[PDB]
């Protein structure tokens, strides 16, 4: 109870003393190795080899553990690469350092050491220090379960599993880029501030540009800009960045999240299906070392094709007692939708009701990688219309672990059609749909100049990261998740 | 005048006819080569070689030019890789395609072709088409000078110099990542929505999260979060992404811009100076093929060290008649500052006035790569204090072409100091400074756990891109610059 305040007081007092000696917070010590480097290169060498090699190195990091055994101590130093042992002895360090300094430091203190590599009796790689310094005094001792999110640095200091998750996140993003670039895609940066937000259906965040006394929105999706670039000739473009949606936080939703949108001209959604499957197989193989990924109580084989069902097949499969004819009648569908708990809004049409039914009925059940095709036109204002059935579009979404991971389709490059669909979206917003799209005249204009047949795909990067790190909340894969005040 | 409307009407009529024949906008044609690929691989081969090689390829792109010479025509097809010639002959294509289709198409129309490679009499690489299709009908004919920005797709279709600039932008970003990763830096993604914006001095954009009924700000800088990660153990982190500042548009300012922030523990600003110099030399060499870069009427030698001056030396050098003692007296400095047109705000202190003087006096003159050191503490709330002179911090900024390209310093890891500086910033905001920082208690807390000595650097990526593409307005290096309504 009070022992914590004694720790705080003790640290402030030790700092006070440092301040009296000179500059309390230096910036002079330089290391030449991180723990991981030392282990990779020297773990396989026995004390004999290391003795003759007589290799001196310099490291720096947090003092995680310290066992003072008189004239000698053993310390665990933790740096960006992991942990390495330090052998701190009174007679190995400059006169007085051991007793007048080292013993006065505290766990959590950032220290720097220079010494010779050797292996302990236990066979561990250790550094027999010849120099040791206190670089940063930690004023607080080393660390609900929401603390991990409110103070992610504490979580990173304490849990190696958490660190590994974020390190893997970086590996995945770098691997996606390498994968995309390998396919001739060029990464671009489109606006995140837009006067007319679009490219998706979501409530946007609105802000105001004082200089132009202009109200603007954080983008909910870069889609409309990326397709403008395809019209401009950048036929293989992709963007991996934030998108913002003024919607509530959840185990799969963060107000700001990372999405990858990619567009390749002269391709349709089938090409995107192949790309998605190869992307996941590549990432699993590349990042995890295997195509079979364990997630919760499941195992996803990214080495086998994703399952593929039309939206209706998924509805029928997960609610077998459904009279499929009900999805063809607005009243029947509205009734069905309502019977299962969906509040049917005045603005919704049959296509929207059917999609909502699909959401309620099947989504949570798509545990194994699944592609859901034949999305109704009503809910796909930017998707190419299907040649045989105008009421649906050449669009799909894919799910893994019961969550939507991506959304892709053959793009709508029919300007007149696009204009009309934007009008419907405007009507819908007038009819109450707060997520309906804004009319984007310049976008239509761009299509009038000619957009090559194209296939676009958006993938929720955070959700994707969850599947590769066995995380069951988006909060575990975003360094600083949105937290409630 | 009316000729444009005749073009529009003609295109709509041709489309109408396509609609009558079936699906006007297909998505079926697939290419296997882009123009650049064909040129790289076959430009060096004469018609003899190509004849015997009898290589068939498929391309797709915009019909830029068409010369109908009776039973044969010559077309310039432009795709993501550039341009390639098409030899379109009546008897080389399926019956009727040439006359009933090809001749009816219009420049700007997206077409696809499949044919054998050969070289024209002029020695140009061309494709003797055997199949040719209209993929997308262009309803508008091929394209103030602000149009390039309002309809960047038109600019990209029309000007290859503009395309090359953006292609180079992508190359530069990819090269920065490769450079950073080569140095063990890990790329992270920190929030772009923050309840307490910080890390810089700027008027932020504010928005509202309905779900949490919480007012939030678009980040002006990720600095405070990146340093939290360093405390957490990610000792070499960097982020390259948007930052938003509610400030006016300029030839060097966009409300949203790309900045790279990097932090490496156990390093000081001198280490950042080396990193910056190597980064520019590497990028020039790597991306431009030479370390000497032509920019406007100048040539920057990124193969030679940047010039380095303290802020005062730059002031003295560019306003030689300045009595340097004036910078040591608030009243004298205020007078000096005002005498040169700077409106000195009530909140400003000596350090701020001196910095403003430097800005007015020297900034525009730093044409050749220059590092400006010794920034006053008052204007550097997050920078490590200098050991000898507490009134200045171990901070620098670097300029090229008379514009600030980067800002870096040894980081302030003295929690108590940081808290006090935040208080001063709060006082300043209370005294009228609309750009002063907010107090960030959690940030201070993070520092209390111990931030290793660190050196951080922020570089304006867009401004950097300008120097490598001879662009003289930021508007030329951002695909969709903020435009006035
Ligand atoms: N032209 C083809 C379509 C391209 C993508 C489309 N413009 C688009 O925006 O498509 P959406 O489906 O809107 O979103 C894409 C994916 O983003 C994830 N996602 C969406 N909201 C999210 C949130 N709040 N938190 C975390 N992740 C979230 C999902 O994986 C989604 O599939
Ligand atoms: N701890 C070390 C400091 C790290 C960087 C610091 N947090 C930072 O934010 O530092 P600033 O200096 O605020 O901005 C960095 C660079 O951004 C560019 N810039 C700033 N505003 C811009 C605008 N409106 N348009 C385009 N570019 C702009 C500049 O190159 C600047 O140097
Ligand atoms: Mg959603
Ligand atoms: Mg969706
Ligand atoms: Mg500025
Ligand atoms: Mg600055």
Residues 6+ apart with CB under 8 A from A483: A146, A149, A150
Q: Cα(B27)–Cα(A267) distance, rounded to whole angstroms?
A: 7
CB-count burial class (<10 Å; 0-12, 13-18, 19+) for A363: middle
Task: Dig out the tokens for A472 from the structure.
Answer: 């069951």
A342 Cα to the center of ligand 1, angstroms: 21
- What φ, ψ does residue A33 adopt, rounded to 5°? -150, 150
Task: Dig out the tokens for A387 from the structure.
Answer: 């040649």
Q: Cα(A260)–Cα(A463) distance, rounded to whole angstroms?
A: 11
Cα separations in angstroms, A126 against A36, A42, A86:
12, 10, 5
Q: Is A133 in the pocket of ligand 1 (CB under 6 A)?
A: no
Q: How far is C-alpha B221 from the geometric centre of its chain's CA atoms?
A: 16
The Cβ of residue A255 has, within 10 Å, a number of other Cβ atoms equal to: 26
- B38-47: list long-range contacts, CB under 8 Å, 24+ apart: B38/B84, B38/B117, B38/B125, B38/B127, B39/B81, B39/B82, B39/B84, B39/B125, B42/B117, B42/B125, B43/B125, B45/B119, B46/B119, B46/B123, B47/B118, B47/B119
Nearest CA to A468 out of A209, A264, A280 is that of A280
Nearest CA to B78 out of B39, B116, B27, B120 is that of B39
B221 Cα to the center of ligand 5, angstroms: 12
Nearest CA to A376 out of A440, A421, A316, A432 is that of A421
Q: Cα(B45)–Cα(A162) distance, rounded to whole angstroms?
A: 56
CB distance B443 to B228 below 8 Å: yes
Residues 6+ apart with CB under 8 A from B401: B295, B296, B298, B300, B367, B466, B467
Atom of ligand 1 nearest to the CA of A223: 7
- Choose the closest CB to B480 out of A31, A212, A225: A225
Q: Cα(B143)–Cα(B124) distance, rounded to whole angstroms?
A: 26
- Choose the closest CB to A479 out of B15, B163, B229: B229
List the B186-187 sheet strands across, edge first: B186-187, B236-244, B256-265, B454-460, B403-410, B392-400, B370-376, B307-310
B380-394 burial code (b ≥16 CB/10 A, e <16): bbbbbbbeeeeebbb
DSSP codes of every residue in B268-337: -HHHHHHHHHHHHHHHIIIIISSSEEEETTEEEETTSPPEEEEHHHHHHHHSTT--GGGGGSHHHHHHHH
Helix (H, G, I), strand (E, B) or coil at B151: coil
Q: Which residue of A has its CA nearest to B412?
A: A25
Experimental technique for the deposited model: X-ray
Helix (H, G, I), strand (E, B) or coil at A66: strand
**CA dihedral for A156, A157, A160, A161, sign (positive or negative):** negative
CB-count burial class (<10 Å; 0-12, 13-18, 19+) for A405: buried
- What φ, ψ does residue A354 adopt, rounded to 5°? -60, -40
Nearest CA to A471 out of A18, A169, A195 is that of A169
A205 Cα to the center of ligand 3, angstroms: 15
Nearest CA to A227 out of A414, A439, A461, A15 is that of A414
Helix (H, G, I), strand (E, B) or coil at A151: coil
Q: How far is C-alpha A286 from the geometric centre of its chain's CA atoms?
A: 17
Nearest CA to B123 out of B217, B60, B44 is that of B44
- What φ, ψ does residue B206 adopt, rounded to 5°? -120, 145
Q: Strand locations in B302-429, DSSP E?
A: 307-310, 370-376, 392-400, 403-410
Nearest ligand to the CA atom of B245: 2
Q: Look up tokens 């019909």; give the residue.
A: B63
Q: Cα(B90)–Cα(B79) distance, rounded to whole angstroms?
A: 24
Q: Is A404 annotated as a binding residue?
A: yes
- What φ, ψ does residue B61 adopt, rounded to 5°? 165, -175
Nearest CA to A269 out of A382, A408, A407, A451 is that of A408
Helix (H, G, I), strand (E, B) or coil at A96: coil
Beta bridge partners of B309: B372
Q: How far is C-alpha A202 from the geometric centre of its chain's CA atoms?
A: 20
Nearest CA to B187 out of B203, B197, B174 is that of B174
Domains of chain B listed by start with CATH number: 4-143 (2.40.50.140), 144-484 (3.30.930.10)
Q: Look up tokens 């949606």; give the residue.
A: A245
Resolution (A): 2.4
Give the containing element (helix H, strand E) for A383.
none
Cα separations in angstroms, B272 against A11, A126, A313, B253, B459:
31, 31, 58, 24, 11
Q: Cα(A261)–Cα(A272) distance, rounded to whole angstroms?
A: 11
Q: Look up tokens 């939030």; give the residue.
A: B216
Q: Is A463 in the pocket of ligand 1 (CB under 6 A)?
A: yes
Q: Cα(A351)–Cα(A339) distance, rounded to whole angstroms?
A: 17
Instruction: Calculate ∠ Cα A59-A60-A62, nearest 5°.
Output: 135
Atom of ligand 1 nearest to the CA of A409: 2
Q: Cα(B74)–Cα(B115) distance, rounded to whole angstroms?
A: 13
CB distance B241 to B268 below 8 Å: no
CB distance B457 to B276 below 8 Å: yes
CB distance A63 to A38 below 8 Å: no
CB-based pocket (< 6 A), ligand 2: B 199-200, 221, 223, 245, 247, 253-254, 257, 259, 261, 382, 404-409, 411, 456-458, 460, 462-463, 474
Question: Is the Cβ pair B229, A155 closer than 8 Å?
Answer: no
Q: Look up tokens 């310099």; give the residue.
A: A58
Nearest CA to B412 out of B426, B392, B436 is that of B392
Nearest ligand to the CA atom of B199: 2
Residues 6+ apart with CB under 8 A from B160: B82
Task: Dig out the tokens for A170 from the structure.
Answer: 């970086």
Q: Which residue of B has its CA nearest to A237?
A: B80
Q: How far is C-alpha A290 from the geometric centre of its chain's CA atoms?
A: 20
CB distance A465 to B189 below 8 Å: no
Question: Is the Cβ pair A450, B137 closer than 8 Å?
Answer: yes
The Cβ of residue A437 has, within 10 Å, a number of other Cβ atoms equal to: 25
Atom of ligand 1 nearest to the CA of A227: 1
CB distance A111 to A133 below 8 Å: yes
Question: Is the Cβ pair A24, B415 closer than 8 Å?
Answer: no
CB distance B217 to B203 below 8 Å: no
Pocket test for ligand 1, best of A225, A228, A259, A456 (most atoms within 8 A of CB): A259
Residues 6+ apart with CB under 8 A from B156: A229, A232, A233, A234, B162, B163, B166
């Amino acid at each position: 109870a009070i022992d914590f305040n004694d720790e705080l007081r003790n640290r402030r007092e030790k700092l006070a003393a440092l301040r009296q000696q000179g500059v309390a917070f230096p910036n002079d010590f330089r290391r030449d190795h991180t723990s991981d480097q030392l282990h990779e290169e020297f773990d396989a060498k026995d004390n004999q080899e290391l003795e003759s090699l007589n290799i001196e190195v310099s490291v720096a990091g947090r003092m995680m553990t310290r066992r003072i055994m008189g004239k000698a101590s053993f310390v665990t130093l933790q740096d960006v690469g992991g942990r390495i042992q330090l052998y701190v002895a009174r007679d190995s360090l400059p006169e007085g350092v051991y007793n007048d300094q080292f013993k006065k430091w505290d766990l959590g203190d950032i220290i720097g050491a220079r010494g010779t590599l050797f292996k302990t009796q236990t066979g561990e790689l250790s550094i027999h220090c010849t120099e040791l310094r206190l670089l940063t005094k930690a004023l607080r001792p080393l660390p609900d379960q929401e603390v991990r999110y409110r103070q992610r640095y504490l979580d990173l200091i304490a849990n190696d599993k958490s660190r590994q998750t974020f390190v893997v996140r970086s590996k995945i993003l770098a691997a996606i880029r390498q994968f995309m670039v390998a396919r001739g895609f060029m990464e671009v940066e489109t606006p995140m501030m837009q006067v007319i937000p679009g490219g998706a259906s979501a409530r946007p965040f609105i802000t105001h540009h004082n200089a132009l006394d202009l109200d603007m929105y954080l983008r909910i999706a870069p889609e409309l800009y990326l397709k403008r670039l395809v019209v401009g000739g950048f036929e293989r473009v992709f963007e991996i960045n934030r998108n913002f949606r003024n919607e509530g936080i959840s185990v799969r939703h963060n107000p700001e999240f990372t999405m990858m949108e990619l567009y390749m001209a002269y391709a349709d959604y089938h090409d995107l299906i192949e790309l998605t499957e190869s992307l996941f197989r590549t990432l699993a193989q590349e990042v995890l070392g295997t195509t079979k990924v364990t997630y919760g109580e499941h195992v996803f084989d990214f080495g086998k094709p994703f399952e593929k069902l039309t939206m209706r097949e998924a509805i029928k499969k997960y609610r077998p007692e459904t009279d499929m004819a009900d999805l063809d009648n607005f009243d029947a569908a509205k009734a069905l939708a309502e019977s299962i708990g969906i509040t049917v809004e005045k603005s919704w049409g049959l296509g929207r009701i059917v999609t909502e039914i699909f959401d309620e009925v099947a989504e949570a059940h798509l545990i194994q990688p699944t592609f859901i095709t034949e999305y109704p036109a009503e809910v796909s204002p930017l998707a190419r219309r299907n040649d045989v059935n105008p009421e649906i579009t050449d669009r799909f979404e894919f799910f893994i672990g019961g969550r939507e991971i991506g959304n892709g389709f053959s793009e709508l490059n029919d300007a007149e059609d696009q204009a009309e669909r934007f009008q419907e979206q405007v009507n819908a917003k007038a009819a109450g749909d707060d997520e309906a799209m804004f009319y984007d005249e310049d976008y239509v204009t761009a299509l009038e100049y000619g957009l090559p047949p194209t296939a676009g795909l958006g993938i929720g990067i955070d959700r994707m990261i969850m599947l590769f790190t066995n995380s069951h909340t988006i909060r575990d894969v975003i360094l600083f998740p949105a937290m409630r005040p």
